[PDB]
Amino acid sequence: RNTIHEFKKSAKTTLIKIDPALKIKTKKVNTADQCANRCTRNKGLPFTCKAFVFDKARKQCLWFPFNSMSSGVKKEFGHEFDLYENKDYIRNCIIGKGRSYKGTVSITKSGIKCQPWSSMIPHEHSFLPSSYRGKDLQENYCRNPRGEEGGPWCFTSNPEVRYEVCDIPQCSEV
Amino acid sequence: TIHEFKKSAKTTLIKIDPALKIKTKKVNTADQCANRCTRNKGLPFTCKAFVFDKARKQCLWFPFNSMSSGVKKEFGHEFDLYENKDYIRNCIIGKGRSYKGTVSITKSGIKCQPWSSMIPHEHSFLPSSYRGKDLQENYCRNPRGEEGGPWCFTSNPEVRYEVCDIPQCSEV
């Protein structure tokens, strides 16, 4: 029942609340998967678990009723922290051209595994994560960093297909 | 792997538009269909759902799900439908009348009571009286389009019902 692989992971990251009104729960633990299991099950939390952090130095879970996109919360850097966001609270559909898409789909329309943004293999490119802050060019996720009409896309792991659009549905289009 | 899919018992999908690709294979169990779908290895499309035929032991992998235009869900006792959660809208439009995701926890963090239970709470919100509205399992639902969005009867005997905390699509 190790559920940790089902969260979207951000290395070296925790979340801080600006709004002192927002609520946390913390517990000293052994391993990150223990935090994940309690979040998934939502056992003994007085709120809906949308994200958790494992502190590897203090061996603690921090469970949150918010995520990195909620208002009144900001990211904080820390070598000891990993952030895990519950995919049920990361919008999985696209608004407009999907400039703001932060979901984890990482396969193209024709079923090709996306190439990591941090990689120049197979395809050399200049969509370096550091050139596109805010656009979450992480792992091999489908993204639309320049807001082009095609919707989110990725460079492709197939050497013969440089890039392809991914097949992510519009949230609302009647 | 199978737990990142929403399961609909006794259900298959029929494509109307014959241009939509399908892939099928004789297999042993539904778990193997899920694995192939999750990792998406030998599929010329994005696997958004699959059906397991328990009688023929066949996987049917689809680049669509039940909310896709051009497909009909149908009863069939030998089929189970499994829909990839990444393709079931996880945010709410309007009051969330059309919410079909798998969130089953209230805003205060209480596990929902199954719709087909009368314990702790008795109610007239049974599955058949609201066909089309997916009062399945213990999922947060908004069958009548009420103000606060999807909700459920609560497993806490002290709390009859409570809204869940499903975000508006316009929230972010």
UniProtKB/Swiss-Prot annotation, chain B:
<feature type="disulfide bond">
    <location>
        <begin position="91"/>
        <end position="169"/>
    </location>
</feature>
<feature type="disulfide bond">
    <location>
        <begin position="37"/>
        <end position="47"/>
    </location>
</feature>
<feature type="disulfide bond">
    <location>
        <begin position="33"/>
        <end position="59"/>
    </location>
</feature>
<feature type="domain" description="Kringle 1">
    <location>
        <begin position="91"/>
        <end position="169"/>
    </location>
</feature>
<feature type="disulfide bond">
    <location>
        <begin position="140"/>
        <end position="164"/>
    </location>
</feature>
<feature type="domain" description="PAN">
    <location>
        <begin position="1"/>
        <end position="86"/>
    </location>
</feature>
<protein>
    <recommendedName>
        <fullName>Hepatocyte growth factor alpha chain</fullName>
    </recommendedName>
</protein>
<feature type="disulfide bond">
    <location>
        <begin position="112"/>
        <end position="152"/>
    </location>
</feature>
